Amino acid sequence: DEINEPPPNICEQCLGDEANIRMTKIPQGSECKICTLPFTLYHFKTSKRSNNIIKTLICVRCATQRNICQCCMLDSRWHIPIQLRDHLISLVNEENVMTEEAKNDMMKRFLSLKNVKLGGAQITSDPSEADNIVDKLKNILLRATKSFFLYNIDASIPEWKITDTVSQLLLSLIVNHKAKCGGLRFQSSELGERFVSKI
Amino acid sequence: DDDEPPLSYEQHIENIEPLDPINLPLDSQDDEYVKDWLYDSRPLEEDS
Amino acid sequence: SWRDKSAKVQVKESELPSSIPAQTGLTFNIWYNKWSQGFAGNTRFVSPFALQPQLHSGKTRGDNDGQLFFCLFFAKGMCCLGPKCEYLHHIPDEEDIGKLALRTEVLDCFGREKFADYREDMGGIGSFRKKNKTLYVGGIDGALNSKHLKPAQIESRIRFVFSRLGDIDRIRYVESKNCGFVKFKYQANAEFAKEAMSNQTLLLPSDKEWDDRREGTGLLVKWANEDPDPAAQKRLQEELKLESLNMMVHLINNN
Amino acid sequence: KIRERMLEESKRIAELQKRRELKQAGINVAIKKPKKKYGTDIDYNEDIVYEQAPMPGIYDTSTEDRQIKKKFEQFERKVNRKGL
Amino acid sequence: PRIKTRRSKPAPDGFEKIKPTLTDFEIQLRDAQKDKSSKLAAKSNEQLWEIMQLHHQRSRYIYTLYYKRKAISKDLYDWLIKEKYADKLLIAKWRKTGYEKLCCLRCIQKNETNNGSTCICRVPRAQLEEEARKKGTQVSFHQCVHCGCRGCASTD
Numbered sequence: 103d104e105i106n107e108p109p110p111n112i113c114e115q116c117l118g119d120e121a122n123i124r125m126t127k128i129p130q131g132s133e134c135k136i137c138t139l140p141f142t143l144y145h146f147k148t149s150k151r152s153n154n155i156i157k158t159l160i161c162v163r164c165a166t167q168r169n170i171c172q173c174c175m176l177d178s179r180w181h182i183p184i185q186l187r188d189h190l191i192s193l194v195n196e197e198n199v200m201t202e203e204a205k206n207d208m209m210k211r212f213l214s215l216k217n218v219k220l221g222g223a224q225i226t227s228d229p230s231e232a233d234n235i236v237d238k239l240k241n242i243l244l245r246a247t248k249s250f251f252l253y254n255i256d257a258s259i260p261e262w263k264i265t266d267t268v269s270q271l272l273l274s275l276i277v278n279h280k281a282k283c284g285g286l287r288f289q290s291s292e293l294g295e296r297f298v299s300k301i
Numbered sequence: 302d303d304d305e306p307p308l309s310y311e312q313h314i315e316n317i318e319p320l321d322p323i324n325l326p327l328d329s330q331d332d333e334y335v336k337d338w339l340y341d342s343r344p345l346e347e348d349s
Numbered sequence: 350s351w352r353d354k355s356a357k358v359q360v361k362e363s364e365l366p367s368s369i370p371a372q373t374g375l376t377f378n379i380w381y382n383k384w385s386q387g388f389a390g391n392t393r394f395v396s397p398f399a400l401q402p403q404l405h406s407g408k409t410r411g412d413n414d415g416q417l418f419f420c421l422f423f424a425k426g427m428c429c430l431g432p433k434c435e436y437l438h439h440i441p442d443e444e445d446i447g448k449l450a451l452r453t454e455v456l457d458c459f460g461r462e463k464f465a466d467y468r469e470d471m472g473g474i475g476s477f478r479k480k481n482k483t484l485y486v487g488g489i490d491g492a493l494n495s496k497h498l499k500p501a502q503i504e505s506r507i508r509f510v511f512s513r514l515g516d517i518d519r520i521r522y523v524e525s526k527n528c529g530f531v532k533f534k535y536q537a538n539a540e541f542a543k544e545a546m547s548n549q550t551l552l553l554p555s556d557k558e559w560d561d562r563r564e565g566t567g568l569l570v571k572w573a574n575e576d577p578d579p580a581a582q583k584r585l586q587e588e589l590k591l592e593s594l595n596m597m598v599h600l601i602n603n604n
Numbered sequence: 605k606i607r608e609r610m611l612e613e614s615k616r617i618a619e620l621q622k623r624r625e626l627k628q629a630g631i632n633v634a635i636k637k638p639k640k641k642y643g644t645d646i647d648y649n650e651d652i653v654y655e656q657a658p659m660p661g662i663y664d665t666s667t668e669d670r671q672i673k674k675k676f677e678q679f680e681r682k683v684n685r686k687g688l
Numbered sequence: 689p690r691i692k693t694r695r696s697k698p699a700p701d702g703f704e705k706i707k708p709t710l711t712d713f714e715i716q717l718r719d720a721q722k723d724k725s726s727k728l729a730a731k732s733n734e735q736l737w738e739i740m741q742l743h744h745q746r747s748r749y750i751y752t753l754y755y756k757r758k759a760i761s762k763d764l765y766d767w768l769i770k771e772k773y774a775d776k777l778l779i780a781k782w783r784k785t786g787y788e789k790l791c792c793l794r795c796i797q798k799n800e801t802n803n804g805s806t807c808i809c810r811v812p813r814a815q816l817e818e819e820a821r822k823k824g825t826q827v828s829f830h831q832c833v834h835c836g837c838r839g840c841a842s843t844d
């Protein structure tokens with residue numbers, strides 16, 4: 103227990119660029135959001151005259167099991183979320199490496215005490231296999247490569263791409279993606295003639 | 302009364318001039334040395 | 350633009366709503382500001398206030414200090430400080446979303462901490478395990494004071510209300526169930542529009558109960574669940590694949 | 605206890621009867637759960653509640669894992685379509 | 689002895705000339721302690737900032753009478769200190785060399801803060817402004833927590 107508690111792991115993006123920080127240790131501050139159990143909360147600030155105060159939110163058991171930061175919840179090596187890291191590890195070697203997430207407040211404070219390094223952190227907790235899968239991502243990346251009535255809108259394109267292109271080809275927009283009746287409406291008929299002229 | 306809140310000092314008490322304490326009236330010459338300070342708070346607080 | 354004028358005061362401090370709410374039960378509790386010996390299952394009401402995004406928004410005190418966060422009470426419609434408010438008093442655009450990117454992983458746009466899992470009923474703040482962008486609008490029949498209104502017009506009013514609070518990826522109103530699913534393009538607009546349009550109405554002056562809109566319950570904006578539409582699932586899988594390829598490019602370039 | 609077990613049994617039967625009637629009507633009322641009597645009372649479908657892993661040895665269990673996962677997924681789909 | 693009891697002494701000479709202006713501060717303090725209810729937190733700090741401002745101004749009045757323009761007798765000024773119309777310690781800080789425009793006595797107390805240093809109102813304005821211009825953001829200190837002081841340096 104707490105007579106030898108490990109030091110925290112704060113992301114280098116979270117600590118900031120100032121070469122000297124002071125952070126406050128409160129030996130039982132908040133309780134952990136993943137772990138439901140007390141820990142020693144740290145609350146630093148990036149520069150001295152920054153506006154907002156960064157504080158750690160998860161336990162050190164809970165941070166090490168996911169191999170993540172405490173302030174940021176991002177993977178400590180690649181600096182990406184857990185849900186995208188598990189997709190990249192799962193897409194390459196085909197293991198479904200997905201992280202198991204416990205409800206039932208007894209079960210989450212049960213899981214936080216075992217020391218197993220949860221799903222996708224087993225690779226990036228070691229530098230060797232974490233570099234090997236980047237070598238494989240090289241191979242996958244190499245094998246990879248006034249009122250107008252619109253019609254034949256692609257079934258998965260949203261409204262804002264249409265509006266951003268019209269703002270480049272220069273308002274309102276009502277697009278029902280089912281019926282594809284893209285009822286665009288400009289604010290001036292001069293702007294309608296403008297858009298007719300540019301196409 | 303049990304349902305009366307305690308009245309505020311700054312309104313009901315502080316603006317009233319106080320009343321007369323006990324103060325046994327001393328003689329003028331038989332009690333000459335202690336008359337001018339017997340009933341103070343700290344009787345010779347500033348007399349070095 | 351909002352960069353020109355300083356942010357107007359929305360409501361005075363004296364004209365704020367009081368505490369000690371509503372006289373629901375018999376005896377009032379002090380440690381919790383609620384009513385006891387009571388009966389309560391509704392406890393909802395139409396919010397008196399609402400923001401007007403072109404009239405109210407402007408520069409503030411803590412915009413010159415570069416604060417990341419947006420004012421909760423600017424959104425809800427009752428910010429009583431104006432040009433003196435510490436937080437931002439404008440709709441989140443691309444530039445403000447680009448600055449929050451280190452902090453939106455953990456906490457809100459308003460600066461509130463995201464919990465591990467949502468709620469029993471998909472309540473207020475999000476969950477930090479999932480970047481949800483689609484909002485569930487419901488309770489529309491209480492929001493319209495039971496004015497049946499030919500559902501394409503209801504979808505038009507839900508289109509117009511949320512068109513001012515940011516960019517919209519897509520809109521859907523459901524015929525069978527009085528609900529709508531609104532997907533924004535960024536997350537901070539979804540958070541802002543959720544807290545901005547809770548407990549509001551859909552009525553607007555030429556609608557014959559505009560003088561009587563204050564009675565009722567008002568609508569619910571909550572978080573949408575996962576979509577069981579297989580077209581939506583395949584679209585989600587394709588978008589996940591393209592995001593995966595982008596992050597593959599960046600991770601290879603960082604080696 | 606005998607009496608309460610019989611009454612809870614018939615109560616569950618009525619609770620499924622109304623759901624099957626509404627399923628025939630076309631409105632799918634999901635089954636409500638029993639309420640917790642205390643704050644950390646445990647639901648037993650959310651998680652394997654005290655999951656103990658079998659501490660792996662020298663032999664390899666990838667293909668048998670895949671074969672079990674196939675069999676269980678196929679059983680759940682068959683109960684969903686046909687109903688046990 | 690702020691209340692007037694039997695133990696008090698009668699006033700010296702010039703007090704009846706300066707009795708009305710001091711009276712103004714008295715009635716203005718009896719607007720400030722009056723419990724106007726506010727829901728916010730900053731708006732509940734504004735009240736205490738107003739009270740500390742009124743106490744500071746009354747002490748500046750008695751100080752600028754006795755020390756600067758020498759307009760009242762020493763025998764009256766000792767009475768005004770005795771009857772708590774003035775703060776003896778705040779005037780004692782005003783008589784120093786580095787401290788003349790001092791707001792209150794919690795902005796020079798080193799023990800109260802997290803790390804040593806005084807309150808930020810004690811800094812000159814130009815030094816904060818050159819550091820804020822060096823980092824290029826802007827100077828973000830509007831109003832102190834303890835007093836509401838906005839730059840109480842001696843040069844400012």
Ligand SMILES: [Zn+2]
Pocket residue numbers: 134135136137138139141160161162163164214
């Ligand atoms: Zn923990």
Ligand SMILES: [Zn+2]
Pocket residue numbers: 420421422423428429430431434435436437438
């Ligand atoms: Zn505000």
Ligand SMILES: [Zn+2]
Pocket residue numbers: 790791792795809810832835837838839840
């Ligand atoms: Zn000061």
Ligand SMILES: [Zn+2]
Pocket residue numbers: 791792793794795807809832834835836837
């Ligand atoms: Zn001060």
Ligand SMILES: [Zn+2]
Pocket residue numbers: 791795807808809810832833834835837
């Ligand atoms: Zn100060």
